[PDB]
Structure formats: structure tokens, C-alpha cells
Amino acid sequence: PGATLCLGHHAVPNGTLVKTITDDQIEVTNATELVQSSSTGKICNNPHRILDGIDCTLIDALLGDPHCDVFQNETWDLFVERSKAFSNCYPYDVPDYASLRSLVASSGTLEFITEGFTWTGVTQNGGSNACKRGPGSGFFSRLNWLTKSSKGSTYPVLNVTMPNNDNFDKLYIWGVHHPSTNQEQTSLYVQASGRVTVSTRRSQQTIIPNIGSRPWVRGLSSRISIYWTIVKPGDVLVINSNGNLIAPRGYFKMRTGKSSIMRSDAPIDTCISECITPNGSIPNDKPFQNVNKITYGACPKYVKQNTLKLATGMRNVPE
Amino acid sequence: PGATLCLGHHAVPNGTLVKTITDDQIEVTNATELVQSSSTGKICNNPHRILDGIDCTLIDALLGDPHCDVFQNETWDLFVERSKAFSNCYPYDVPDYASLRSLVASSGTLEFITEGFTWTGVTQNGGSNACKRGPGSGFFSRLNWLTKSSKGSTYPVLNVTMPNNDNFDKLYIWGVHHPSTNQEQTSLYVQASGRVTVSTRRSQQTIIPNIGSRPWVRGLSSRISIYWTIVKPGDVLVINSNGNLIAPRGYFKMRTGKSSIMRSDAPIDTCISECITPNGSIPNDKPFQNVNKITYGACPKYVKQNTLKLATGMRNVPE
Amino acid sequence: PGATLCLGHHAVPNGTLVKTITDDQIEVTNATELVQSSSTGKICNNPHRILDGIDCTLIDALLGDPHCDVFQNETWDLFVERSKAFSNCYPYDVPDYASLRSLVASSGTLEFITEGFTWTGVTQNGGSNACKRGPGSGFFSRLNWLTKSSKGSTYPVLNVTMPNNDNFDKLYIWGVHHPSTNQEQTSLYVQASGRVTVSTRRSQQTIIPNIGSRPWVRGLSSRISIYWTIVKPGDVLVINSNGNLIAPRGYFKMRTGKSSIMRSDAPIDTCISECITPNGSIPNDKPFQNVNKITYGACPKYVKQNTLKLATGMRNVP
Amino acid sequence: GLFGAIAGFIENGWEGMIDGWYGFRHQNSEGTGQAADLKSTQAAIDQINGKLNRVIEKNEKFHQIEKEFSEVEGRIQDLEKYVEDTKIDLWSYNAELLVALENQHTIDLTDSEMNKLFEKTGRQLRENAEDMGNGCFKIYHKCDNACIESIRNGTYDHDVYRDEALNNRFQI
Amino acid sequence: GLFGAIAGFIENGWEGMIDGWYGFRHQNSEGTGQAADLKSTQAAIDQINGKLNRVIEKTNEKFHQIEKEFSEVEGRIQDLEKYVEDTKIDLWSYNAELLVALENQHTIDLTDSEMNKLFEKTGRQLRENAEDMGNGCFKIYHKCDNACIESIRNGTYDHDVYRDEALNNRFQIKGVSGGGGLND
Amino acid sequence: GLFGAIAGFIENGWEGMIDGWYGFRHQNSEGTGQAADLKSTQAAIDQINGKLNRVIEKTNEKFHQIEKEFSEVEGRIQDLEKYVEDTKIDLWSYNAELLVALENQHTIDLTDSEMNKLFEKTGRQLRENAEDMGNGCFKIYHKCDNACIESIRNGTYDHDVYRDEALNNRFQIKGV
Ligand SMILES: *[C@@H]1O[C@H](CO)[C@@H](O[C@@H]2O[C@H](CO)[C@@H](O[C@@H]3O[C@H](CO)[C@@H](O)[C@H](O)[C@@H]3O)[C@H](O)[C@H]2NC(C)=O)[C@H](O)[C@H]1NC(C)=O
Ligand SMILES: *[C@@H]1O[C@H](CO)[C@@H](O[C@@H]2O[C@H](CO)[C@@H](O[C@@H]3O[C@H](CO)[C@@H](O)[C@H](O)[C@@H]3O)[C@H](O)[C@H]2NC(C)=O)[C@H](O)[C@H]1NC(C)=O
Ligand SMILES: *[C@@H]1O[C@H](CO)[C@@H](O[C@@H]2O[C@H](CO)[C@@H](O[C@@H]3O[C@H](CO)[C@@H](O)[C@H](O)[C@@H]3O)[C@H](O)[C@H]2NC(C)=O)[C@H](O)[C@H]1NC(C)=O
Ligand SMILES: *[C@@H]1O[C@H](CO)[C@@H](O[C@@H]2O[C@H](CO)[C@@H](O)[C@H](O)[C@H]2NC(C)=O)[C@H](O)[C@H]1NC(C)=O
Ligand SMILES: *[C@@H]1O[C@H](CO)[C@@H](O[C@@H]2O[C@H](CO)[C@@H](O)[C@H](O)[C@H]2NC(C)=O)[C@H](O)[C@H]1NC(C)=O
Ligand SMILES: *[C@@H]1O[C@H](CO)[C@@H](O[C@@H]2O[C@H](CO)[C@@H](O)[C@H](O)[C@H]2NC(C)=O)[C@H](O)[C@H]1NC(C)=O
Ligand SMILES: *[C@@H]1O[C@H](CO)[C@@H](O)[C@H](O)[C@H]1NC(C)=O
Ligand SMILES: *[C@@H]1O[C@H](CO)[C@@H](O)[C@H](O)[C@H]1NC(C)=O
Numbered sequence A, B: 001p002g003a004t005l006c007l008g009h010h011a012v013p014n015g016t017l018v019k020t021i022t023d024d025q026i027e028v029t030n031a032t033e034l035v036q037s038s039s040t041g042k043i044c045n046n047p048h049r050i051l052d053g054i055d056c057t058l059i060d061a062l063l064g065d066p067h068c069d070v071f072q073n074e075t076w077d078l079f080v081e082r083s084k085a086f087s088n089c090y091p092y093d094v095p096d097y098a099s100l101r102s103l104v105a106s107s108g109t110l111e112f113i114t115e116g117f118t119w120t121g122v123t124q125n126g127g128s129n130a131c132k133r134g135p136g137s138g139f140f141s142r143l144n145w146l147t148k149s150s151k152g153s154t155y156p157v158l159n160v161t162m163p164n165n166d167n168f169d170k171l172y173i174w175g176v177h178h179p180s181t182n183q184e185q186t187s188l189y190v191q192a193s194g195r196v197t198v199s200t201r202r203s204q205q206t207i208i209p210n211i212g213s214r215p216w217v218r219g220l221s222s223r224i225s226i227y228w229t230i231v232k233p234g235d236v237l238v239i240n241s242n243g244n245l246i247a248p249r250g251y252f253k254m255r256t257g258k259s260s261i262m263r264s265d266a267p268i269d270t271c272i273s274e275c276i277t278p279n280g281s282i283p284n285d286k287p288f289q290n291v292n293k294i295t296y297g298a299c300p301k302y303v304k305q306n307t308l309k310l311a312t313g314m315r316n317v318p319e
Numbered sequence C: 001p002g003a004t005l006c007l008g009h010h011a012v013p014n015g016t017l018v019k020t021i022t023d024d025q026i027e028v029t030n031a032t033e034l035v036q037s038s039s040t041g042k043i044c045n046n047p048h049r050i051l052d053g054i055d056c057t058l059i060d061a062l063l064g065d066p067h068c069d070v071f072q073n074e075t076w077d078l079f080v081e082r083s084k085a086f087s088n089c090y091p092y093d094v095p096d097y098a099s100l101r102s103l104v105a106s107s108g109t110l111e112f113i114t115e116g117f118t119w120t121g122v123t124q125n126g127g128s129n130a131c132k133r134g135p136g137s138g139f140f141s142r143l144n145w146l147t148k149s150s151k152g153s154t155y156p157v158l159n160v161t162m163p164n165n166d167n168f169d170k171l172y173i174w175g176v177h178h179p180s181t182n183q184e185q186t187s188l189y190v191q192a193s194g195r196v197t198v199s200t201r202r203s204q205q206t207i208i209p210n211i212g213s214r215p216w217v218r219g220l221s222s223r224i225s226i227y228w229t230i231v232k233p234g235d236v237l238v239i240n241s242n243g244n245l246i247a248p249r250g251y252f253k254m255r256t257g258k259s260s261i262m263r264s265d266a267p268i269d270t271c272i273s274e275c276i277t278p279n280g281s282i283p284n285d286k287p288f289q290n291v292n293k294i295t296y297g298a299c300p301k302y303v304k305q306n307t308l309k310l311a312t313g314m315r316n317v318p
Numbered sequence D: 001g002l003f004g005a006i007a008g009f010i011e012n013g014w015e016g017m018i019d020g021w022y023g024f025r026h027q028n029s030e031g032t033g034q035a036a037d038l039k040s041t042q043a044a045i046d047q048i049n050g051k052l053n054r055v056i057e058k059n060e061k062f063h064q065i066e067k068e069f070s071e072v073e074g075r076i077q078d079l080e081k082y083v084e085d086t087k088i089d090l091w092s093y094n095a096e097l098l099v100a101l102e103n104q105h106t107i108d109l110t111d112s113e114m115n116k117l118f119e120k121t122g123r124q125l126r127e128n129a130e131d132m133g134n135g136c137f138k139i140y141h142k143c144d145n146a147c148i149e150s151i152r153n154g155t156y157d158h159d160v161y162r163d164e165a166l167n168n169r170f171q172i
Numbered sequence E: 001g002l003f004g005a006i007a008g009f010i011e012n013g014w015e016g017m018i019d020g021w022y023g024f025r026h027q028n029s030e031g032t033g034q035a036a037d038l039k040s041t042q043a044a045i046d047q048i049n050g051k052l053n054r055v056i057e058k059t060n061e062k063f064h065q066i067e068k069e070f071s072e073v074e075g076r077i078q079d080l081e082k083y084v085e086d087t088k089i090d091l092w093s094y095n096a097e098l099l100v101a102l103e104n105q106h107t108i109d110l111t112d113s114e115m116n117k118l119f120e121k122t123g124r125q126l127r128e129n130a131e132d133m134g135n136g137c138f139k140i141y142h143k144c145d146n147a148c149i150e151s152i153r154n155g156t157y158d159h160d161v162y163r164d165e166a167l168n169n170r171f172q173i174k175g176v177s178g179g180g181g182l183n184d
Numbered sequence F: 001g002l003f004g005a006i007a008g009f010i011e012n013g014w015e016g017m018i019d020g021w022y023g024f025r026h027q028n029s030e031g032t033g034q035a036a037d038l039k040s041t042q043a044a045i046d047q048i049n050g051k052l053n054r055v056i057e058k059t060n061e062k063f064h065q066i067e068k069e070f071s072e073v074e075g076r077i078q079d080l081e082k083y084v085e086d087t088k089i090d091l092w093s094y095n096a097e098l099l100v101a102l103e104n105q106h107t108i109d110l111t112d113s114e115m116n117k118l119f120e121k122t123g124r125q126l127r128e129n130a131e132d133m134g135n136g137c138f139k140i141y142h143k144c145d146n147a148c149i150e151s152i153r154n155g156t157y158d159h160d161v162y163r164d165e166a167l168n169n170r171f172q173i174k175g176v
């Protein structure tokens, strides 16, 4: 007449396999997934300020391609560039494009302040049928195509100065015009050879135009090259040219902050999500993810494994 | 009247010291080495396709330096450059040589397609005695040295186009000639200073030649400067020169894949190894190696340790 | 009739909290701190050779700004650049400035050996009011400003050469002068347009001077751009130019070693310390530090945590 | 398991125990029963949960380097790709090693909590019980339900039964 | 703790114990006393030290490196420099945090383990002369003056000397006619 | 070890034990014998192979990469290329150092554990018929012949069969 007291532990009908130091697969009562491997497919518009570029690139929105005028003075946490974006103004290039795109994306703003530049002796507001505005020819909104004076056929040595008496850095975007024939060079600027020199107290850039043919884009073999100059407070911008200057109209304000840019063809949706990938938002309740190595926000760290199981119960040993 | 039962574990005559969290050295019965520290000294020709440069650099083989002619239309997984390699053609330089070397190495092929460029008004197939093809004067096989017409004073503005109507990327190599004196400049090209503008639809380069002496090499004070342009499908090449143009004769086919290039002075051998180092192939059964940080293939990871002992038996206790 | 024996462990009144794998905070008897989070605010003058730039950047010392003359031939383990440094010579820039500064900092020396360049047919040794030397006009100690010949009013193609028959690498610092007006360009150099080609057997740089108005910097709108050429043993320098050449006077010896450069406003004082940060020397007895990601020498590794306690005793149960 | 209780001298687990991770099943005069030990259960669950909270604890990054490229560029693009690929491999390694280490330690601490309860029980029982070697105690005296309960909440006074038990153990 | 002795069946530590990490309190015919046990105390200390010296071994020496602070905006190349350095600090912050959490988990368990090892040793040495009271104390069933206690602390205790006296006190059953032996 | 049996209450290892990692020695009325235990020897071995097979498993294919040696001083970009590769090597070097140290610690501890488990397993078989002598040995208080030693080794041993005999020997008691 005695008693038995048994010591035991629970089990479940079917548990889950996990990895260990010693075993590839061993069954436990229960695990949990540490790798996020799915996205909703859509980019959530909160809590970050998302700006969809749609047909426009950031550089085109910056320069002021007419089909991008909607983007004047825009600001963003995340700028979204779509693959379908296209240019529709004067054919151009930016030497070191990726850096200009980077530093503007990182500044988070396209706030423009027009300034009162004075262009003595030259015709202003040059346009082109490669860039059409309203009923006629046109040009980039933030740039100013200067050509010879209307009567006299004369193009002076341009010499403007512009001081920075604010407490912020100004970004100037300017450019050089490369014509396709000498005839075009001299009819526009008189001088057989042009020259653009932009300098501050800290720096100087002189660019010499190049005459000749590039492939036909929207009617032109000509080209414009884009350059930029940052002018710190207490400093001064001097522009010196005797031909081919695509002059600035003002400065872009520069800021620092969490702003960036992403390339994605994910639709934008009204939802809350801290983490954005090219594919849409993904939740961040796990530490790792397999969705994209490109992320913006408070995001799981990207790993190569599409699953990692974290045992959260004892070893499961069925009956 | 009774008995004794003794429990116990094995020991061996001589055990191995290993490191632990708690002990710098402790004797266990057995361990295994995790760091590969030796090489046979030879590069195995399998399973990766190995091309031995021998006297040739990749860039010299790409350009068509005559003693490298044996490498025309060649392909590789790994190109091996010897330090005994040497140039034997026109003295040249490549601005960002490292990038041209990398993009070609990574493409894995010197497949070249000639195209029927028309150079109206100039003498083609120029040659020098610094670049002998057999006993007589010659040039890089893939470049085409254009000079003034065999009429006294003519070098026109060369202006040619070549469209990419294929479904792959085309790599064009071209060049600018830098004469050593002014007499030389006008005697080859008529014009006092030349120009070369090569461009596509979204990019351009113009190179202005510089007249002057450089150190004497193979009889020459002159230089050629090598440049490249990748043309995507749908895009179109434009070449625009009024002198000093070292022209392409066609394009190289571009590819993507596992291809690379490595500097080694190690003999090739008939055997198999997945992992290659400048020192030859090394086995990849260990997870780490101390041989070289430069590897190719399926390799143990480079670590600064020459030995790492992984205990594969119990602690060793002999008395 | 009997006894009782009680096994036990020790405890302290109030111990330290530490992190573990399963507990965020659990109390142990002793812990040790693994992150160095503070500095005295001084840079120890030992054991490294610290060279205080004071008023001078490394580059102004390289070029030879007159107030930097005291740095001629200096050597350093670490060059320290200060907030109040200033240039006081000809206004200049350096394309790829970060690289020249990097490679000179890492070489650890300003040993300069002047060489006998012959500049036939031009005037040497020009100076500016922008770079005064006593009450006179002056120029960077290491550069030779050349102009049209004194009485001929001619500037020839200069074509000089200089071989490296030594067993070390030679570093040449040279320049190109950018005038403000065409009157200045032709007045100095005769040719309406200059040119400077500096080359070795396998490499070359050719530069075209830029003419134009620029804001004044020390009374001038004109500029110099600085360039460099390394010449290995067996190779040859060749300099070719028909105007606007700021000539090298010779070479810098080049070395390899542990040398580097650091920006800092910390003073230097007596103590011994293997690890330097911009904020002062720090001890390296801990494995990690939170003072500055910039360091020099035998240093704890930089982590984001300002504290990490390593338990050095058993759980505390009072 | 390091401790040899789970998947060890305990041969299997109890699917019927759906209110604890550990517990007691008994047999006596009055029949058979079952209860969870809430303390050892809570100790296990507390340790799993802390381990979980530490891991799933929320980095934040914004403007970064580009990681996909639409054009061949060479040296600088090479490096950018290498930087990211090196990064991903290092975190991938961390992730992997982390779960393997953690899982190993989960199994062992739950094995540990099982062993500790079996031993706590054995110490209570003193000379009145014997360990059958499979996680059962043979109790050598009359233990009704309130007696079994007293063991399970740790108030079992062993002196009360020592006489009876001792004489049953040392028998023939 | 894995082994269940510190914060386990040992209810709490001794603040009076100031010359050892582990030890013995007792009670006998001559009263109470306390003594640290040197072997188990040193075993813990040697392991912690071994660990401490692994972690604080100076390995890291670097001289010229990349720039980590910038005074102007440059784009691509500066982005990558910042990226590189930000990526490294994160990896090293992670190693750092993982190391001390893992180490501390282990320091606690190996010190719990030492306590447990000392307790089982003492038990094994006593044999049938004592019983585990379940709280870290053995009840010793014979007369054990101070010399005797010391023999258990220094490991010389001969159980055979006392087995007869012990067993005799230990298994007395009230209900049977067997209390103590009265044969001489 | 955390479990106190190897380099612990077992004084040392048996070099003559060459057919297993763990096992038994005995003396009875019929002389002495030695036999290795299979389950614990395999349990230890299987665990170590599991982790050795994890560690040495091939997981690294890289093809085109950055340059890692240079023949000219260049400045900024080459500084970054060297810093990146050196950062990497240092992190993998740490990983490898830590890996081996953690593993070697566990290896020593699981083998200590397997030894302790076999001992406890054998203690529980014997019930009240034997006593833990404190050095990894059991004094068995009845007559146990080779068939009997073998029944303890193969796990069928029946303690009730020997209990009355052993109990009577364990508790025999001398007067003064
Ligand atoms: C240098 O050579 C190029 C190519 O031969 C010349 O560019 C060519 O100019 C003609 C007219 O400007 C372009 O023609 C047209 O084709 C488009 C469709 O592609 C059509 O929409 C137009 O109505 C017209 O028929 C031609 O496309 C353009 N070629 C290219 C490839 O850009 C160039 O004119 C020559 N340079 C000079 C200054 O002569
Ligand atoms: C500018 O100066 C350079 C160097 O002072 C001149 O280059 C020199 O021209 C001579 C004549 O061809 C070269 O000479 C020869 O030496 C080689 C061995 O190196 C030998 O094989 C030949 O038979 C001949 O004797 C000389 O090497 C070359 N020097 C250099 C450094 O490049 C150059 O001619 C001057 N330029 C002008 C246009 O005046
Ligand atoms: C192009 O425009 C710029 C800006 O106006 C002109 O630069 C200016 O030249 C004047 C006289 O050469 C400089 O003036 C003076 O101010 C200083 C104090 O700052 C004083 O010490 C002098 O006595 C004098 O009053 C002015 O600073 C300078 N501006 C800049 C930005 O450098 C330039 O002359 C024009 N270029 C041409 C070719 O006309
Ligand atoms: C997230 O989006 C990316 C691209 O938008 C997807 O990745 C591509 O996946 C295919 C499938 O292997 C690859 O062949 C491409 O090379 C990928 N791009 C890159 C750069 O890796 C990815 O599959 C998406 N994720 C989900 C879950 O839909
Ligand atoms: C693999 O080859 C390399 C380079 O050829 C050898 O490494 C050189 O080793 C010496 C001394 O070991 C150092 O002085 C050089 O600095 C090394 N080069 C570098 C940059 O590390 C190496 O020892 C060879 N390894 C084997 C296993 O043979
Ligand atoms: C070491 O010096 C750096 C100076 O750069 C100090 O860090 C700055 O700290 C403030 C606030 O703590 C930040 O707002 C700045 O962004 C920091 N600068 C950088 C570049 O990180 C730091 O506090 C000093 N630390 C010690 C311990 O002295
Ligand atoms: C942008 O904002 C500024 C802020 O005052 C203002 O000057 C300017 O008018 C705005 N831009 C446009 C597109 O009008
Ligand atoms: C499985 O474990 C997770 C975390 O431990 C927990 O959220 C969940 O409730 C468990 N599931 C079951 C079946 O209890």
C-alpha cells in the first residue's frame, strides 16, 4: 500500500524543427521566425514623408524640366524614383551625376530662392523646341540660357558676383552649353570659343565648351553639362563668362536630416510602416529580413537566409 | 564477499592543447585544424578556365599589342598576370586603367567584332616602328590610327555614327594621340590642336590632346591615351574628331558571370581545386585559411591566425 | 548526539547589475567595465612622435607657406592639424586635396632634397605680395614661379628632365598658374594659352590653365593649382611647358611606416599612452571604447555602447 | 541534453499536461492525479521570454550607399558592391550563429529546470522514498491526496512518515 | 543557474564569509564555526581570471586609416566612407554586446556549478553517516567534535570510523523494538 | 567541466580503454574485467560530429572582387580599399577565434556531461544494493558474478533479486 509520484514535462502533438550547435534538425515544442520574408507589396505613406517622382527623376525635378514643374519647392523623407521616368527638356549630362543626385536626395528639399542676378549686355531666357513651354520654345525653370544681345550681335565678358549673407549653405546649379557647329557657337555667343568660370573664396571651376555632334536627342546634337557650387555663409559666388554660360536664377537651400531616395516600382499606399524596401513596407518585429538589401527606416538587418527558427519551448519528445 | 564497479573514460598517450573560453591551453584527447596554411604552389587548371597571360597584360591583349595577338577572341574564368609581362607597342596610358582592367576581366572575353566604320577623307591604318609587326612598322590590332589625307593639307572633321542594334552591350575602345612637337601635330593632322568627342545618348567625353615630350620609350616621345565607351542596345555611338583620333575598328562583346583576373607568378598544373590564391590552389575542406587574402573560387575565409584547433574529443587526464 | 554541516557561498551587501542572455539586469558580486568612456583631454607626448601643426596644415608645410618654414624636413608619427590653422601665401587649390594630404601624412616626412633644374630662357623665383617674406615679396619655399625672360619678352618651351637613380621613391610637388585676365596671362608668359605636361615612363598629367576673374583672396583673383608626381627608382621625370608652370625645386623623400595625421584641439602634455583620439589620449586596458571612432595606435575598438559590464563573480544573494 | 532529464531518464513528455511545462502525476490509495508545478514552469518561461526580448529588440538607417547599378563603372562600383556583400555575409553569420547558440541553450535550460524539480522533490522525501530511475519516486508509506499535495507545495514534513517508511523499505 | 544551488537550494549567501567564495558553517558539541573552502574558491577565481584575460588581451593596433569626419559635402565617395565606417562600428558593437551577455551567462553558471560540485563532494565523503537536509546542509548522525569537522573540510574524513555510530543513530524505528544496539 | 566527473571525481582516464569513450571496470569473485559503453560513447561522438560538420561545411564562393594589393601610392580611394579589406579580415578573425573557444568549452562540458549521466544512470539501477564510493566507483554489497556485472552493463539488472542480501550487508553494525 504505497504511492508513486512521477515527475514529468509537457509535449505537443506536432512541434517544430530547429537548428542547434550539435544538431541540424531537432524537434522542440515550439519556435518563432526571426527572418521577415514577405512584404505587403506597397509602400506606406506614414510615418515618413514619401514623395513619388512618377515620370520625373530628382535631377529633372531639380533642374526644372517642364513636366516636373509640379515638384517645385518639394520636400521629402524618401524620394521615390520610378523606372518609367523620362527626360523631356534639353539633352544634358551631369559629370558625377550620382553625387549630385545623392547630395540633393540627402538634403531633403528642392526649395528655391530666385536671386537678382544682373546679366548686362546679353539676351536672357533662351529656349528650345527640345523643351517646350506653353505655345513655344522653352527651357529648364531653374536655369537661364544667356545669348548675344539682340541688336549689335555682341556678347560681353559677363561678370556677376553674389554674396551669401545668410547663415545657411546655398546650392547653385549652373551649366555649360556645348554647341554642335562653329556656326551655332558664333551665332549664339559671337566668340569662336566660350568659357565659364565659377568661383568662391574657397574654390574655382573653369569649364571650356566642346563643339561637335552627339547623337540626336529631341532634335539636337548639342548638349548642356551641369555643374554645381556650394557657397557657405560669409562667402561669395563669382560667375565669369564670355560665352556658353547656362546661368543660375538662384540657390537651393541645403539641409541635413534623415532624407534619402529610393528606386522602386511599388505603389504608394495609405498605411503606417517604419520600414520601406523597394518592394513596399515590411514589418520590423523581427531582427532580420530576406526581402531586400535596400531599406529605408527602422528596419530588420538583411540576411541571406529566408528562415531562422528560434526555439521558444523545450525539446519535444513524443509518446 | 562483494564487488566493485568502476565507471571511467578513455585517455590517450599524447593529447592536443586547445583554447577555450576559460583556458589558453588545455589538453584534450583530440582536435582538428580549421585554418588552411599551406599551398601546393601551383594553380590547378580545373574546374575554372585559367588563361595564363605570360608576357601579356590583359589591357595589352585587349588593345592588340602584337606579341599579345595570340589572345584574340579569348575567354577565361580567371586571367593570370605575371610580373614578367611587358608592353611592346606605342607608349600609352589609360586614365583609370584599374577600371578598364576590372570591367574587362569581369566580362571574361576578348571577343571582338569588326564594324565597317567609314573614315571619309583621311589615311587609315597608321603605324609606328615602336610597335613592330614582324620586321616592319605596325600598331595595336583593334585600334586604327587616322592621319591626314594623302593630299597635302586635308584632315576633315571626322563625324561617324554606329548604332547598337543588338541585344547586348558593346564595349568600344578608342584613343587620342598626343604628339611630341608642333611640327608633328600639323604634319599628321594638319590642325594645330585636335579634338576627340565620343558620345552616346546620355553620355559624352571629349579629350583635348596635349603637345609635348614624355620620356623616350621605344623611340618615341609621343603618347597615346586610351578611353572606353559602353553602348547599350538602342543607344548609338558617335565619334567626332578633327585630329588625333585613334579610332576603334569595332567592339568587344560584354558578358556577365564569375570571371576575374589575378596577379600570380605560380605555375599552372593539371589537377583540380575550387580555390585559387596567388600562391596556387589550396584545399577548401577547412573553414579558414591563412594563405592569402586574395582568393578566387570556393574558398576558406581569410583570417589572421595560422592555426585554430577545434577539440573533437574529451579532456585528456592520464594521472 | 549529532552535528550539522552547512555548505554555502559568499555575498556582498549591494553588488553590480549585469546583462545576460536571459536577464536584462541581474545582480552579481563584482563586475568589470569593458568600455573606456573617458579621456583626460590631453594628448600624451609619449611614446609617439607628435608633431603639432599649430598655425599650419600639413599641405602648407609641404608647399612651404612662409609662416610654416619651421616645419622643413620634419618627421612625425602623428601630424596634428588645429582649428586655427591658416594659409598666408599665394591662393591655391589642390585637385584631389584629400589624397596628397593622405599620402604625405602616411609617409611621415618632409625631407626635401633640392635638385639642379635648369630653366633656360625664363625668369625664376617670382614672388607675390600675397605671400610676403619679411618686408619683401615671396613665395612657397618649395616652388619656383617662372615667367618670360627678363629682357627678351619671350617664353620658350621648357623641356627639362630629371632621372631617379636612387633606391627610394621621389615625390614631386608642382603647380599651374591660373591668371585673371588675358593681359596678365600674356604679360607673364607671352603665349596666349599655357600648358604643363609632367610625365614618367608609364604615366602623365597634362594641365591647361584657366583664365578668369575670381573673388579676391589675400588681394588676388589669380590662383595656383597643385599637382604631384611620384617617380620610382629607375624611372624619369620630364617637365614640358610653354607657360604657367610653377616649377618644382626638387623632391620629397618617401617612406612607408606607421605615420598618420589627425584633426584635434586637445593639447599635448607629459604622459605615456599608446592610444590617441582627437579628444586626448585614452588608456588601452579595456577592449572597447566610446570616446571617438577616430583613433591612432594600440586602441580599444570603437563601440556605440557607453558601458558594458563583465561579471567577475557569482550571482549575489543577500 | 546536458542534464539528462528531458530525452533522458524521463522517457517522454505528457501531451495531457496542458497547463504547465512541468508537473506531477501521482498514484495512491485514492486514485491517480496530475498537477503542474507553476514555479519551475514560470522559471523556464521567464528565461525563454527574456532571451526573446533581447533578440527581437528593435537598427535605424536612412541615406546609405547605392546597391544596384544600371551601368558598368569599374573600380568605385566594385568597392561599393564588395562593401555591401561583405556586410551581408557578416550579419548572415551572426544571425545563424545566434539561433544555433540560443537553441542549444534553450534545450539545455529546459532540461535543467526538469532536473532541478526532480531533485527538489527527492530532497523533500528524504528517507521515505526511493528513486525508481525513470523520474518516479516510490513512496513507502500511506500518502493520500492531501499528502501528495503537501509534497507539491513543499510543506511535506518527512519526520511524520519516517518511521512507517523506514520499516517498509527495510523489509524482508 | 543551471545547477540549482546558488539562488537555488542554498537560500542565500553569507556576507560574513569574507575569506572565500565557498565554505562550511557547522554546529556541534563545541558550538558553531565557519571556514572558507580554498579549492572550490580558487577554481572559480582561476576560471573567471582566464576569461577576464582573454577578453582584455590587447590585440588592436592601427595607424593610418580612412577619414571619418568631413567638413564639406561631396556625395558618392564620402557616402561610401561613412557607410564603411558605420557598418564596422555596428558589427563591433554587436560582438561587444554578445560577448558580455554570453560571458556573464556562463560566469553565473560556472559559479553555480562550483557550489554544486563542492556540495556533492562533501556528500560523497560522508556516505551513510549523514543526510542531505535539502537546503545545503548535511545532518551528521554521530558525535563530531572540531577535529572531526576539520577532517571533512580537508578531505581526510574516514567514514568507516563512524559508520557504526551513525547507522545506529540514523535508522532507529520507533514502532518495531529496534532503537539503538545494546550489545557490548 | 561544469559537471565534475572528468578531471573531477574520476581521478583520471584509462589509456587501456581503446574500444569506447566511456565504460566500466570491475572486480568480483571471478577476478577483473573491463568493458566499454556504447550508448554514451556514441552520444558524445554524434554530438561532436554534428558540430564539426556544421563548422567545416563549405559556404563561401566569391569570384570578382576588389583589388587587395597595389603597386603605386594613390591616396583616397586606395585608402578606402585597404581599410575595407582590413576591417573584414579583423571581423572574420574575431569570429573564428570566438567560434573555436566557445565550441571547445562546450565540447569539454558535454563530454563531462555524458560521463556524469552514465554514472547517475548506473547509480539508479543499483537502488539500495550499492554505494557511491565518491571516486566514480560503486561498492556492490552482494555477490555479483560476471553474468551479474553484465546485467548492470546491458541495463537489465534486477535490484529486488539482490536487495535483501545487500541491505543486510550494508547495515550490519558492530557494538562497542
Ligand atoms: C554627324 O553625323 C550624325 C549622324 O549621321 C549627324 O546627325 C544627324 O542629323 C540628321 C538631321 O539632323 C538626323 O536625321 C533624322 O532622323 C530622325 C530619326 O532618327 C528623324 O526624326 C529626323 O526627322 C531626321 O530625319 C540624324 O538622326 C542625326 N544623326 C544622329 C545619329 O544623331 C550629324 O548631323 C553629323 N554632323 C553634322 C554637323 O553634320
Ligand atoms: C626634351 O628632353 C628630353 C630629355 O632631355 C629629350 O628626350 C631625348 O631625346 C633623345 C634623342 O632621341 C633620346 O635619346 C637616345 O637614348 C636612348 C636610350 O635611352 C638610345 O636608345 C637612343 O639611341 C638615343 O641615344 C632620349 O632618351 C630622350 N630623352 C628623354 C628623357 O626623354 C627630348 O628630345 C627633348 N625634347 C625636345 C623636342 O627637344
Ligand atoms: C568681377 O566682379 C568682381 C566682384 O565685383 C570684381 O572683384 C572685385 O574687384 C574690386 C577691385 O579690384 C575688389 O575691391 C576692393 O575691396 C577690398 C576690401 O574687400 C579693398 O581692400 C580694396 O581697396 C577694394 O576696394 C573686390 O573685392 C573684388 N570682388 C571680388 C569678389 O573679388 C572684379 O574686379 C570683376 N572683374 C573684372 C575683370 O572686372
Ligand atoms: C524584392 O524586389 C526585388 C527586386 O524588386 C526582388 O529581387 C530580384 O529577385 C530575382 C529573383 O531571384 C533576381 O533574379 C533579381 O536579381 C533580384 N534583384 C536583385 C538585385 O537581387 C525580390 O525577389 C523581391 N522580394 C520579394 C519578396 O518579392
Ligand atoms: C603566399 O604568398 C604570399 C605573397 O606571395 C606570401 O606572403 C608574403 O609573406 C612575407 C612573409 O610571409 C611578407 O614579407 C610579405 O609581406 C607577404 N605579402 C603580403 C602582402 O602579405 C605568403 O607567405 C605565401 N603563403 C604561403 C602559405 O605560402
Ligand atoms: C569626443 O569628441 C567628440 C567631438 O567630435 C564628441 O562628440 C560630439 O558629441 C556631441 C554630443 O555628445 C555630438 O552632438 C557631436 O555630433 C559629436 N561629434 C561627432 C563627430 O560625433 C564626444 O562627446 C567626445 N567624447 C568624449 C568622451 O570626450
Ligand atoms: C519656395 O519657397 C520660397 C520661400 O519663401 C519662396 O521664396 C518661393 O516663392 C517658393 N517657390 C516657388 C516655386 O514659388
Ligand atoms: C510558441 O512560442 C511563442 C514564443 O515563445 C509564443 O508566442 C507562443 O504562444 C508559443 N505557442 C504555443 C503553441 O504556445
Ligand SMILES: *[C@@H]1O[C@H](CO)[C@@H](O)[C@H](O)[C@H]1NC(C)=O
Binding pocket: B030, B031, B032, B312, B313, F052
Ligand atoms: C580525431 O578527430 C577527428 C574528427 O573528430 C577524427 O577524424 C579522427 O578519427 C580522430 N582521430 C582519432 C585519433 O580518433
Ligand SMILES: *[C@@H]1O[C@H](CO)[C@@H](O)[C@H](O)[C@H]1NC(C)=O
Binding pocket: C072, C073, C111, C112, C113, C114
Ligand atoms: C632638409 O633636408 C635635406 C635632407 O638631406 C637637406 O639637404 C637640407 O639641407 C635640409 N634643410 C633643413 C634641415 O632645413
